[PDB]
PDB file of C-alpha atoms in Angstrom:
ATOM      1  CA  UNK K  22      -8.136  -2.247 -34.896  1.00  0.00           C
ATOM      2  CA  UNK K  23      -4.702  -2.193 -33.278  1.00  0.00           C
ATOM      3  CA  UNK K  24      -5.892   0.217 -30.858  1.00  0.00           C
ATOM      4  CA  UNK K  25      -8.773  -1.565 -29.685  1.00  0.00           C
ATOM      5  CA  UNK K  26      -6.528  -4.792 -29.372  1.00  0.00           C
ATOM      6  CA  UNK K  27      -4.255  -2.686 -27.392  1.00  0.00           C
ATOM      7  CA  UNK K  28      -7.003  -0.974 -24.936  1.00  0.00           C
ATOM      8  CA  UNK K  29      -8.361  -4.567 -24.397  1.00  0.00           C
ATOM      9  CA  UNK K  30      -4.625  -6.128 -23.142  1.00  0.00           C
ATOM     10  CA  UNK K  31      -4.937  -2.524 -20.331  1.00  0.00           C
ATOM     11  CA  UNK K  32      -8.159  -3.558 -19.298  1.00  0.00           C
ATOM     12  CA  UNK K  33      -7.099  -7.182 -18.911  1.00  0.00           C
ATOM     13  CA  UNK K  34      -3.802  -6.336 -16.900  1.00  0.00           C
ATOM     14  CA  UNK K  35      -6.123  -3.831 -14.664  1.00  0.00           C
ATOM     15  CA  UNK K  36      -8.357  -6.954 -14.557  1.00  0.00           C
ATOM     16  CA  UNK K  37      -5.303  -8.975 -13.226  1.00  0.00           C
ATOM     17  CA  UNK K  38      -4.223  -5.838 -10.921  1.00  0.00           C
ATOM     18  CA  UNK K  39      -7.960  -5.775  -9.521  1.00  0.00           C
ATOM     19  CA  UNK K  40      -8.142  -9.501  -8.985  1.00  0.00           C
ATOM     20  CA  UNK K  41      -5.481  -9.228  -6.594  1.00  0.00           C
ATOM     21  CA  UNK K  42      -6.763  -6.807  -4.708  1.00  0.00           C
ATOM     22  CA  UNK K  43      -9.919  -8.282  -4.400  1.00  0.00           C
ATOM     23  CA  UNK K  44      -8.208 -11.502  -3.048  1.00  0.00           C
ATOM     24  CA  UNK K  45      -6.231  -8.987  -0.608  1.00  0.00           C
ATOM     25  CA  UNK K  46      -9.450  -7.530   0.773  1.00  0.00           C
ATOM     26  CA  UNK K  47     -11.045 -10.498   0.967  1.00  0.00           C
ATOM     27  CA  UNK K  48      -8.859 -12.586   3.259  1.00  0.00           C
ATOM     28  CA  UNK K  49      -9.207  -9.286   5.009  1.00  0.00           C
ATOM     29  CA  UNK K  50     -12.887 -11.185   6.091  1.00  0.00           C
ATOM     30  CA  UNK K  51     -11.870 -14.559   7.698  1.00  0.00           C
ATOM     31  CA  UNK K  52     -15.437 -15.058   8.977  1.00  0.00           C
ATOM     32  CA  UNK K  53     -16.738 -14.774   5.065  1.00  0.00           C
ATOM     33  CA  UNK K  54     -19.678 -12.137   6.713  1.00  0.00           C
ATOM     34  CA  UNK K  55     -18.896 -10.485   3.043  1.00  0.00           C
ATOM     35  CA  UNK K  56     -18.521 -13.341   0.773  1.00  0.00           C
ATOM     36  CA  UNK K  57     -21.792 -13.782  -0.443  1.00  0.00           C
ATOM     37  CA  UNK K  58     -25.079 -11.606  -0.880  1.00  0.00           C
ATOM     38  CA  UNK K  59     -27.423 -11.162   1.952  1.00  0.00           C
ATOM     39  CA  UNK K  60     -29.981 -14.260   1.984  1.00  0.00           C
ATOM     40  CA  UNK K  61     -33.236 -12.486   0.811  1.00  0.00           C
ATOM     41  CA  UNK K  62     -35.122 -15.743   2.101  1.00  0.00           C
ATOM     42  CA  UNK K  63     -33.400 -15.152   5.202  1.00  0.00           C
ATOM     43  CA  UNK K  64     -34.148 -11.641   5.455  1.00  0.00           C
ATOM     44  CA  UNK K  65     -36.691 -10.760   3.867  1.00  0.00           C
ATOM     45  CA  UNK K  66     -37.053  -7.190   4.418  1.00  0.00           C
ATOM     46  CA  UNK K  67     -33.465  -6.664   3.342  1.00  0.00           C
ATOM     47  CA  UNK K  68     -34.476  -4.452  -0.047  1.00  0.00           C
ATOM     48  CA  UNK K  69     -37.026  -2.004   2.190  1.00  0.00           C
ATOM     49  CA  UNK K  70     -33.647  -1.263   3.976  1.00  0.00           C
ATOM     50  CA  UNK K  71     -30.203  -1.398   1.669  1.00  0.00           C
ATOM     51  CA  UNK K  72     -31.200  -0.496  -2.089  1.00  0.00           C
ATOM     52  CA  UNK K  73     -27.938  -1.136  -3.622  1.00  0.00           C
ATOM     53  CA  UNK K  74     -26.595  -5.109  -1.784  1.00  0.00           C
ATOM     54  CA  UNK K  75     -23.457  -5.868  -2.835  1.00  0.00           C
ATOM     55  CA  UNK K  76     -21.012  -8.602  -1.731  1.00  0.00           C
ATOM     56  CA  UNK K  77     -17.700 -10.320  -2.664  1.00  0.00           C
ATOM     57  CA  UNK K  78     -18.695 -13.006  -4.709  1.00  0.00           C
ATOM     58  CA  UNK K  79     -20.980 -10.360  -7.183  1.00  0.00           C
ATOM     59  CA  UNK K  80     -17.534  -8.258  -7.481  1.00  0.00           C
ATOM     60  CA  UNK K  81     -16.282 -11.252  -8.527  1.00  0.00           C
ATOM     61  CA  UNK K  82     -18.646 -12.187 -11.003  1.00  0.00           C
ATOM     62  CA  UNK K  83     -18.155  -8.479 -12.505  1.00  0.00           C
ATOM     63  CA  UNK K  84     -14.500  -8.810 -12.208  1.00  0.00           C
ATOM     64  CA  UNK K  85     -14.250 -11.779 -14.334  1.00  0.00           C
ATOM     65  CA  UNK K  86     -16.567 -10.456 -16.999  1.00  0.00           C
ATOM     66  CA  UNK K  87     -14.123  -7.281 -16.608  1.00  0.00           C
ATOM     67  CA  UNK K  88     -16.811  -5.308 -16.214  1.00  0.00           C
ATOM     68  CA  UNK K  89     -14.275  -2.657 -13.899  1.00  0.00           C
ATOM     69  CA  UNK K  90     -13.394   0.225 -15.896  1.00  0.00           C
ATOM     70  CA  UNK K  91     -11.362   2.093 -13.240  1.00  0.00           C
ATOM     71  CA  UNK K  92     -10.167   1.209 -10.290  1.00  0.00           C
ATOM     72  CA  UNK K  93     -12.710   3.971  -8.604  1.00  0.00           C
ATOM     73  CA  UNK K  94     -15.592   1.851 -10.016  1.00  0.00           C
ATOM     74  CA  UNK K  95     -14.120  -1.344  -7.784  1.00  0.00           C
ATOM     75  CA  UNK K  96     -13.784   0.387  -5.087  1.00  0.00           C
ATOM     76  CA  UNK K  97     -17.168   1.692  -5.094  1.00  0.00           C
ATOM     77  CA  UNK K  98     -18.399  -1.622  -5.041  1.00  0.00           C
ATOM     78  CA  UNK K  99     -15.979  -2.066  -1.818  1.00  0.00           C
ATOM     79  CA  UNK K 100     -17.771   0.735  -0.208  1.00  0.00           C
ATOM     80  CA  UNK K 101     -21.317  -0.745  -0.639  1.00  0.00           C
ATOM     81  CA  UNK K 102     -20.476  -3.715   1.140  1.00  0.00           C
ATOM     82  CA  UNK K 103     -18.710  -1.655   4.235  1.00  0.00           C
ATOM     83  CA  UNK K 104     -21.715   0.889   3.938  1.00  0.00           C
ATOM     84  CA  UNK K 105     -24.695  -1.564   3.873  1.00  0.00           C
ATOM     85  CA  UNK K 106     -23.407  -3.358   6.734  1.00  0.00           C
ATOM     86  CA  UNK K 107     -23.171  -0.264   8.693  1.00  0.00           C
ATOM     87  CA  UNK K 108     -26.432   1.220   7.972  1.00  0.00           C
ATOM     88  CA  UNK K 109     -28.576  -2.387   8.477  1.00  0.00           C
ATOM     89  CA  UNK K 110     -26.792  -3.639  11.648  1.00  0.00           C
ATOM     90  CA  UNK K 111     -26.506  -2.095  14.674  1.00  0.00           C
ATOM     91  CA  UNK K 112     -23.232  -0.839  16.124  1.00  0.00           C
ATOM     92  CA  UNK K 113     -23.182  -3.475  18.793  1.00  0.00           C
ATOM     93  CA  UNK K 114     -22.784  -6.371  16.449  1.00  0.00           C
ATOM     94  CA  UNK K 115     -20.380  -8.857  15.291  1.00  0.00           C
ATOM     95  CA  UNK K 116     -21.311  -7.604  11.419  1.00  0.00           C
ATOM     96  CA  UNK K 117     -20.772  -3.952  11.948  1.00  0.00           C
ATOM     97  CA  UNK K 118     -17.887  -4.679  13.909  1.00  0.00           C
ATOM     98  CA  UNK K 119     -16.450  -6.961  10.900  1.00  0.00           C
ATOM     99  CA  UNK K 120     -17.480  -3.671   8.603  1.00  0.00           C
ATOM    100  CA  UNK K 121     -15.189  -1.519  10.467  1.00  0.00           C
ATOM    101  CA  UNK K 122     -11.985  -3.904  10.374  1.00  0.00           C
ATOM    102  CA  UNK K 123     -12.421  -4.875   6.908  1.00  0.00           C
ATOM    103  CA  UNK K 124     -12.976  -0.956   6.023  1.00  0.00           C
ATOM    104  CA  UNK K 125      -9.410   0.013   7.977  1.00  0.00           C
ATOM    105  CA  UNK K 126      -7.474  -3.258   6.843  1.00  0.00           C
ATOM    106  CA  UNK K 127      -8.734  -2.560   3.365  1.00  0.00           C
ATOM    107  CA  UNK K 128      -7.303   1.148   3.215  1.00  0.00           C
ATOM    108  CA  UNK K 129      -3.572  -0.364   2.909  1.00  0.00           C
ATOM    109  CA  UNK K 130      -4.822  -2.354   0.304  1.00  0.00           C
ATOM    110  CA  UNK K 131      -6.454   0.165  -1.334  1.00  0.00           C
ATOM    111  CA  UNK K 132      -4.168   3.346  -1.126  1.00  0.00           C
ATOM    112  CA  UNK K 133      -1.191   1.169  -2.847  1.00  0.00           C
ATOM    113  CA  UNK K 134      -3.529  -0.168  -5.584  1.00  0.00           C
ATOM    114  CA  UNK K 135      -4.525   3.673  -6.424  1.00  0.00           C
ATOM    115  CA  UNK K 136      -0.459   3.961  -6.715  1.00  0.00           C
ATOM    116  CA  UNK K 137       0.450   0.836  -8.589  1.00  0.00           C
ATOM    117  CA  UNK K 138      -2.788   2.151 -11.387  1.00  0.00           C
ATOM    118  CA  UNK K 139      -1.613   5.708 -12.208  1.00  0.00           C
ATOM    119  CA  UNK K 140       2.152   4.363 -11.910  1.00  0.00           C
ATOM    120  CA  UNK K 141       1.516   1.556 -14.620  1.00  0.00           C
ATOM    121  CA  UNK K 142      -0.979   3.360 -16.081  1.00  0.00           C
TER     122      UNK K 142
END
């Protein structure tokens, strides 16, 4: 259909919108802490403690697949990363203190995307 066709060319320019963002939040993490999923050979335990890992380059790979319906769904995903950090290192760390930064430099990011979706709609 017509409609489908059209429904498909939103979710491809909220695709586009979200790959931006992602980019934004990401050179948000200079030291790449959040590029890619925690090393399970590395730590091992990792799955006792964080049930839900997430990372930058998995958004990615969902991203591209445009498997984002909503820009709340992305920024779930954003959350998980911040979250899990938090909860699995202490607060005396280089990682949690990389959470924190990337959480408040992210919120700019963030608060115009939700502006820029319900404008263009």
């Amino acid at each position: 259909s017509m409609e489908q066709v059209a429904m498909e060319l939103r979710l491809t320019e909220l695709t586009r919108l979200l790959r931006s963002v992602l980019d934004q939040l990401q050179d948000k993490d200079p030291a790449r802490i959040f590029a890619q999923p925690v090393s399970l050979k590395e730590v091992p335990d990792y799955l006792d403690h964080i049930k839900h890992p997430m990372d930058f380059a998995t958004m990615r790979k969902r991203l591209e697949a445009q498997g984002y319906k909503n820009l709340h769904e992305f920024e779930e995903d954003f959350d998980l990363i911040i979250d899990n950090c938090m909860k699995y290192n202490a607060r005396d760390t280089v990682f949690y203190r990389a959470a924190v930064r990337l959480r408040d430099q992210g919120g700019v990011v963030l608060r115009q995307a939700r502006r820029e979706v319900d404008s263009i709609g």
